[PDB]
Design a protein around this nucleic acid. Structure first.
Lengths: 359, 215, 35, 165, 23, 183
RNA sequence: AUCAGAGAAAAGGUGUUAGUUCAUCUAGACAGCAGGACGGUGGCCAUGGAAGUCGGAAUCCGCUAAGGAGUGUGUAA
RNA sequence: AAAGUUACCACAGGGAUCUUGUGGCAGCCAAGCGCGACGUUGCUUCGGCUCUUCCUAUCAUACCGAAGCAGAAUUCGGUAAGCGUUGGACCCACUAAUAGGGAACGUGAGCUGGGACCGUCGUGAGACGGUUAGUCUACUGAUGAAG
């Protein structure tokens, strides 16, 4: 799912034109009446088989590109179902598979019928009949291609989460400063907007602390976004980083945040919980001044500890002539006393005797 | 076929009557001329339609239609014209001026401010500060969400960090200079209401007096 | 790979004629000329 | 990256400096491009543009019209299954026929119960050869009734017939 | 020719063109 | 049509002679020469007015009258006011290094997108290249021939072309920002 | 005619030339500049939301010189 | 008493002897000229080695266009035949790639592999014969008289 690596899905009209053009360009297209009936039958059969092979190959590639929902991880499958109606996607894939099987059956029937062809017109009519039926089947499966293409675009844009490694899930009230803390902690810069549910989708960012890799995953404020956040937090080996607005500057009262945390406690069970008192200047309780940006590093270190407990010569060469063009001279880098002697050469061998080896 | 420019079409279905619409405007102007009194000559100005509607609200209706169409329909010659001595009044009658019935003091004194347009001259020389753009020339107690305004403006502004930034200062207008197309567009975008609507009440077409003064 | 008639390669050959060639060959001819 | 990342890039950095003008120029010059295209291209791709442009004019004319009102010895033909002197190929033989009802106007795939009469030849009628104009009886319980084959099964590849009703 | 194909046609080809024009 | 004419009034430019269809316009800024031998148009010079006349011409040849009229007007504008093109450098990570040689007649560009290739572009005759001081990373193309200046700007933009990358994200390049007269 | 000239046919062409018909036009023809392009109303639903322009039904209206329950871009809106 | 019939027919004889990429059928519309286009409803003996060139309807190489095309790796589409397009047994591995075709009997005077009549005995059936009958030129280089 998150692996993407799926080729673009063309439209129904584009796919039909691509298939027909490929068959026309690859297969021969010169068959006169002077050839034998067997040759005419063979030419028609070859064209039909090539068209069938091209259609089958594209359909198989489309079917293989879409990952199986069952084989995906429980967190990935839940997110896909919440975001893209996995039941509808499975129905579309099944419909495409059925259409491919029907196309292959139609091609096989047409090939068998054309094997006993009579004349050029009968072969030409049979060749047209198979192509039209394949085109009709392709045109019939029109909305499925559009739905699959949208799913592929969403899947490619989706993040590649890694719940297996140590992770810190930041979820809670919208704009409670958890997103700002996650943006500061990780290299990723999550967009923050005054409108609620600004981070509609999850944002995952890697971080390094105490020679360990921690995956900071932000969640939408708590709707489809809320449901996706709940599904991600349900199946993930991660530490909860719920943030409560101490100053209530996020628009959510302290009592409301506490009630939401108590309700979401079922998902936060069997995990290290952190209660981040946001906007202090404006379950382990840690005070982090969202307005003053104070205590974020301490909270991150505390959460990480809880999770762990729970679990030049080159410059000269480039300036002079550049790499591969500048000849480095080892004569200069010598400890010879006389500079003239170091820069001057000596006879290695003379008169049949190695002067260097005999001096 | 032939080399001709293509003509575009839309689906509003709100086309005016054209010749019939002009005839209706002339008929309404004649009825307004035949109205009771107040002998108003005022239709529009540089102000917006909302200002015109507000002005027309305090009346019991400003209407001109096409400029000089009513005068042409009435006739330059006094015999053709319903009024008297309209030969000289026809030349004076021009622009957006129309009859109305309710005023004189409000027109003379009250002149609501409105956004300026091209062709006029700004009363001062407003200078746009460099750096981040200010919607109200730094009078707000300037949102950064006007990203599309950077492309729409066309001025030397670079969208740096999602905020429009001006590399160098550029005055919007200069005193003693006519309002150009860009200057008028910038003035309309900003808070520059360098305009004041006026009215024309030189004369009155009295039923009995029939004395349209030229003052 | 591009062939020897690659238009860019001819352009780069022209550029390098006046960089690592030309002058050091002209005076080279001059030296054995005055000889 | 995550989700709409160039949409994040467009937000925080901006668009290409001249994209709006280039897209405007491309749209403006498209008319010259299409007219040029209609004259230079040749072959299959030209014939596709010819058919595609003819279609576009037809729908465009309609959309305007919708605008204004708003304002060896073997059988060589497909058959259905001494007397069998010839050979009837199994692949050529067909058992199901697509019969379209006249009043209902619906095509139903019914089994070929038998062949009533083939006007081409009584031997073909005896052999049950499915040809154009041949009368064949099919089950109508789910709708037995006769029907005339209005197509050529040897060329179309399907037994497309119309109900005699 | 000059294009790809000879404008001049075979004599039997001309006659059958005349025959095709007739029918 | 029998008669198809375009009339042009001349400014204080000294010479607008069209001898042998060769327009040699000498103005306060300088002298520009162009050859209009590819158009069969009468060039009548009377006083302060020039008439481009075509008799019994087809539509294809008739379209040349206005095109000739504009290009002559453009070069007359050059000899009187001149043309100036302002282009803004655009760079995301690597600043684009621009150096001017022979008073700017040749521009060599380095450090583009990290590339070590030194792209050398020579401007067309009648054009000079300068670096603006009021605005950073600003290149000014001024001269007499509008076509030469615009062609030089197009050549610079075409040379600085991002290849094999996503245009939607990669925005590095040199583009025209302002086109107009010297004063 | 960058493939001139000496059945493949249904068509396509911002290729040219004549006509045929119908339309506007000093009440100002097109085209271009300068503007308006409004008020109920964010009509009614829809959903993180869609204020004419996610979308589904309505398609009313006062004012005018004219402004749609909106031509598209755009907007999270 | 036999007679009709045979397209269920069988055994002998006599006569005759341009091509490529869009399915069909049935309806609803349906610009228009009873048809009626685009749209819309249903349902489903041959066969292959070498070789020479040639075509492009391009597998690779070169350059562009588009696509949620971040990068990389791709996919699709243009120009394009200059240059290539293996080695072994549906494979296999290498390879940048292991593209499709023509030389109408591709190159069998480059190359190789996987009877007829008559008679006789004959029911619904098949075999045991007598005759028989084939048909200088071009290119590669080498000299060479001569205004």
């Amino acid at each position: 799912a998150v692996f993407k690596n799926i080729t673009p899905i063309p439209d129904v009209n584009t796919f039909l034109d691509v298939v027909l053009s490929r068959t026309q360009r690859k297969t021969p297209t010169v068959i006169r009446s002077g050839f034998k009936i067997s040759r005419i039958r063979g030419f028609y059969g070859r064209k039909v088989k090539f068209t069938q092979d091209t259609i089958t190959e594209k359909l198989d590639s489309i079917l293989q590109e879409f990952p199986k929902l069952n084989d995906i991880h429980p967190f990935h499958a839940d997110l896909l179902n919440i975001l893209y109606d996995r039941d509808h996607l499975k129905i579309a894939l099944s419909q495409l598979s059925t259409a491919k099987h029907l196309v292959e059956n139609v091609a096989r029937d047409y090939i068998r019928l054309l094997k006993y062809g009579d004349s050029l017109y009968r072969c030409k009519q049979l060749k047209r009949a198979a192509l039209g039926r394949m085109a009709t089947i392709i045109k019939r499966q029109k909305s499925s291609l559009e739905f699959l293409e949208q799913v592929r675009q969403h899947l490619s844009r989706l993040p590649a989460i890694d719940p297996n490694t140590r992770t810190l899930l930041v979820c809670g009230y919208p704009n409670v400063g958890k997103s700002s803390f996650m943006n500061k902690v990780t290299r990723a810069q999550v967009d923050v907007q005054p409108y609620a549910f600004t981070t509609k989708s999850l944002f995952v960012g890697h971080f390094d602390y105490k020679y360990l890799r921690w995956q900071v995953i932000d969640t939408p404020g708590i709707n489809t976004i809320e449901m996706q956040s709940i599904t991600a937090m349900a199946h993930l080996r991660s530490a909860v980083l719920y943030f409560m607005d101490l100053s209530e500057m996020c628009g959510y009262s302290v009592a409301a945040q506490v009630k939401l945390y108590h309700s979401i406690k079922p998902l936060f069970a069997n995990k290290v919980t952190i209660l981040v008192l946001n906007k202090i200047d404006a379950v382990k309780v840690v005070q982090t001044s969202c307005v003053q940006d104070i205590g974020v590093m301490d909270v991150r270190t505390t959460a990480c500890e809880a999770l762990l407990a729970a679990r030049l010569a080159r410059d000269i060469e480039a300036a002079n002539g550049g790499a591969g063009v500048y000849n480095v001279e080892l004569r200069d880098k010598y400890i010879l006393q006389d500079p003239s002697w170091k820069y001057d050469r000596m006879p290695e061998l003379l008169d049949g005797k190695n002067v260097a080896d005999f001096v | 076929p032939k080399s001709r420019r293509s003509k575009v079409l839309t689906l509003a279905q709100t086309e005016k009557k054209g010749h019939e619409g002009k005839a209706a405007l002339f008929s309404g102007v004649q009825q307004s001329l035949d109205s009771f009194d107040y002998m108003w000559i005022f239709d529009v100005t540089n102000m917006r339609n909302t200002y015109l509607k507000r002005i027309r609200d305090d009346w019991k209706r400003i209407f001109m239609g096409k400029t000089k169409v009513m005068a042409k329909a009435l006739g330059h010659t006094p015999e053709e014209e319903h009024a008297e001595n309209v030969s000289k009044l026809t030349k004076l009658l021009h622009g957006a001026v129309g009859l109305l019935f309710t005023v004189i003091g409000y027109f003379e004194s009250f002149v609501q401010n409105d956004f300026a347009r091209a062709g006029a001259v700004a009363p001062f020389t407003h200078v746009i500060p460099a750096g981040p753009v200010y919607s109200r020339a730094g009078q707000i107690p300037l949102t950064h969400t006007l990203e599309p305004q950077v492309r729409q403006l066309g001025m030397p502004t670079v969208l740096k960090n999602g905020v429009v930034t001006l590399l160098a200062d550029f005055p919007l207008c200069t005193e003693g200079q006519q309002l150009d197309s860009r200057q008028t567009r910038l003035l309309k975008l900003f808070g520059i209401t360098a305009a004041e609507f006026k009215v024309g009440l030189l004369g009155y077409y009295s039923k009995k007096g029939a004395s349209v003064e030229f003052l | 790979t591009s062939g020897p008639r690659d238009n860019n390669r001819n352009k780069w050959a022209k550029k390098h004629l006046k960089k690592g060639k030309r002058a050091k060959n002209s005076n080279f001819s001059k030296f054995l000329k005055k000889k | 990256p995550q989700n709409e990342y160039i949409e994040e890039s467009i937000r925080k950095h901006g668009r290409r400096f001249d994209h709006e003008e280039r897209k405007r120029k491309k749209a403006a010059r498209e008319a010259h491009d299409a007219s040029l295209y209609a004259q230079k291209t040749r072959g299959i791709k030209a014939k596709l543009y010819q058919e595609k442009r003819r279609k576009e004019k037809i729908q465009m004319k309609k959309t305007i019209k919708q605008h204004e009102e708003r304002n060896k010895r073997m059988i060589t033909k497909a058959t259905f299954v001494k007397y069998e002197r010839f050979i009837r190929p199994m692949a050529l033989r067909q058992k199901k026929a697509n019969v379209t009802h006249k009043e209902l106007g619906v095509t139903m795939q019914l089994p070929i119960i038998g062949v009533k009469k083939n006007p081409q030849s009584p031997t073909y009628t005896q052999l049950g050869v499915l040809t154009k104009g041949t009368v064949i009886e099919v089950n109508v319980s789910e709708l037995g009734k006769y029907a005339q084959i209005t197509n050529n099964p040897e060329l179309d590849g399907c037994v497309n017939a119309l109900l005699l009703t | 020719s000059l294009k790809k194909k000879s404008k001049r046609r075979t004599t039997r080809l001309r006659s059958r063109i005349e025959k095709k024009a007739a029918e | 049509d029998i008669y198809k004419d375009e009339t042009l009034t001349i400014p204080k430019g000294v010479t607008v002679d069209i001898k042998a269809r060769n327009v040699t316009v000498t103005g306060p800024r300088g002298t520009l020469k162009q050859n209009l031998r590819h158009v069969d148009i009468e060039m009548k010079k009377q006083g302060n007015t020039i008439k481009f006349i075509v008799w019994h011409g087809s539509r294809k040849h008739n379209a040349c009258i206005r095109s000739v009229y504009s290009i002559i007007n453009n070069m007359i504008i050059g000899v009187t006011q001149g043309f100036r093109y302002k282009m803004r450098l655009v760079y995301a990570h690597f600043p684009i290094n621009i150096n001017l040689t022979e008073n700017g007649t040749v521009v060599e560009i380095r450090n583009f997108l990290g590339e070590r290739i030194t792209r050398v572009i020579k401007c067309l005759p009648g054009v000079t290249v300068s670096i603006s001081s009021a605005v950073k990373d600003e290149i000014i193309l001024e001269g007499n021939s509008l076509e030469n200046v615009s062609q030089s700007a197009a050549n610079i933009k075409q040379i600085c072309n991002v290849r094999n990358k996503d245009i939607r994200k990669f925005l590095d390049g040199i583009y025209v920002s302002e086109r107009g007269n010297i004063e």
